[PDB]
Design a protein around this ligand. Sequence first.
Ligand SMILES: Nc1nc2c(ncn2[C@@H]2O[C@H](COP(=O)(O)OP(=O)(O)OP(=O)(O)O)[C@@H](O)[C@H]2O)c(=O)[nH]1
Ligand SMILES: Nc1nc2c(ncn2[C@@H]2O[C@H](COP(=O)(O)OP(=O)(O)OP(=O)(O)O)[C@@H](O)[C@H]2O)c(=O)[nH]1
Ligand SMILES: [Mg+2]
Ligand SMILES: [Mg+2]
Lengths: 106, 173, 171
Amino acid sequence: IKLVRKEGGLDDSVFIAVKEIGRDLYRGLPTEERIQKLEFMLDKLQNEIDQELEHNNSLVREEKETTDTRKKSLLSAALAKSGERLQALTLLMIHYRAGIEDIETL
Amino acid sequence: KVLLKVIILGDSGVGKTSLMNQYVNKKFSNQYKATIGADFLTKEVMVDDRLVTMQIWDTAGLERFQSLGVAFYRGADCCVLVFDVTAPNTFKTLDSWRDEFLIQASPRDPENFPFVVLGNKIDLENRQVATKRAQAWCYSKNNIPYFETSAKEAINVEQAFQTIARNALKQET
Amino acid sequence: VLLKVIILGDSGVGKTSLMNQYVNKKFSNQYKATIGADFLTKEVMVDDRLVTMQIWDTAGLERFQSLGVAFYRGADCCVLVFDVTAPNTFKTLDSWRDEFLIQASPRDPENFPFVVLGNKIDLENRQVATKRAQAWCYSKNNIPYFETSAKEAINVEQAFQTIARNALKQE
Ligand SMILES: Nc1nc2c(ncn2[C@@H]2O[C@H](COP(=O)(O)OP(=O)(O)OP(=O)(O)O)[C@@H](O)[C@H]2O)c(=O)[nH]1
Ligand SMILES: Nc1nc2c(ncn2[C@@H]2O[C@H](COP(=O)(O)OP(=O)(O)OP(=O)(O)O)[C@@H](O)[C@H]2O)c(=O)[nH]1
Ligand SMILES: [Mg+2]
Ligand SMILES: [Mg+2]
């Protein structure tokens, strides 16, 4: 497959920022409760990503198999919006991952 | 099962987290628990006959330094703008929150994108932003609905989010 | 002195597994599709000095890509991965390399640092032969070629040591 060109796609600075802020996530809580709340969030985020990714895959299968141009165009817009939700969820997971990585550098 | 993604925005302290918790969990904390940590809650809601899933994102924290709207706003179907009716400066910043979302989320039809404005803390019985004043601002912003709410007393909370759901649903495929 | 390395190639070939085996020394059997991108950081020693290496993992699936043109312009080295059991992933290497060069537009594109990993050699019934991949790498300005297994950590350390040396060329 190929490398999509996206003129206003994401830049370095977004990933650096979610990690820099995520490093201090729930700082203030006891080192016991902090790692609890972070694990809970990463688990919840994975389940949500899994759910959305299954809906995404279902939209992919159905778009491949549709002949009707109208229904194909609707499936593509739904797949696009699913893709946007997955980007936000993945960046949130990266955000909370930085909290975990903060605990284990210490 | 349609999924509706809702972003709640506004200044620190206006009651964003409390409005979400009161709508989803039916609980209110009198204690001030400031938002450390972007998060979202999920709730099934019935919109006129359709059952839909609403995801309510609470992304904003202590100070705005975060460009994290670039990361988290994408895919939203509606944006809720919240101010504290007892703190006129939180109303003054609404333009910048609305513009922030429009620049960082880039919705497909910016001038028709569903916004909803909540003026929160009416139970404090101190109203420094007048009802007509908020409605005038709202009217000028492509006629978006305004609700006065209390997350503390659950005043207009169910009503506000029912309209949020409907308008989020209305602009879709 | 920070080195920006990006990993490219078809979905499923093992880009994320290779990065996680080199930095975290771990490997997982289960597949979690990469959405967008992520990076890990690693201090690496080149000659007798520590340089910071920023290793960017990217989505193989086209619909999950989100990086802009500005991102690729800052890459110091690009790692091309394919699966020795999956000849289509070898076939597409040209389009990964060429599309990257268009977007990165390096000043001398034909000497930009690439490194090619042929992954999953721990599997039986490999369908791309070592000499065939070597022939391709030679034809493309003689770019280094490693056969790797993320599952068994074969050549992972050796490959990334060359990646780091190549990234310093640019920087
Ligand atoms: N009296 C009254 N107090 C409220 C109401 N809603 C929220 N509060 C209080 O206002 C304070 C701020 O609440 P939050 O919900 O955390 O506000 P926030 O908008 O999420 O902003 P941050 O705390 O900065 O993240 C807390 O002490 C709440 O208890 C309300 O409707 N009436
Ligand atoms: N046997 C074997 N399996 C591997 C090896 N490397 C990766 N895998 C497995 O192959 C599958 C795909 O690996 P990933 O690292 O997720 O592939 P990817 O290139 O990052 O795929 P995308 O994120 O979709 O672009 C996973 O189930 C891995 O467990 C390897 O060297 N040998
Ligand atoms: Mg809050
Ligand atoms: Mg991957």
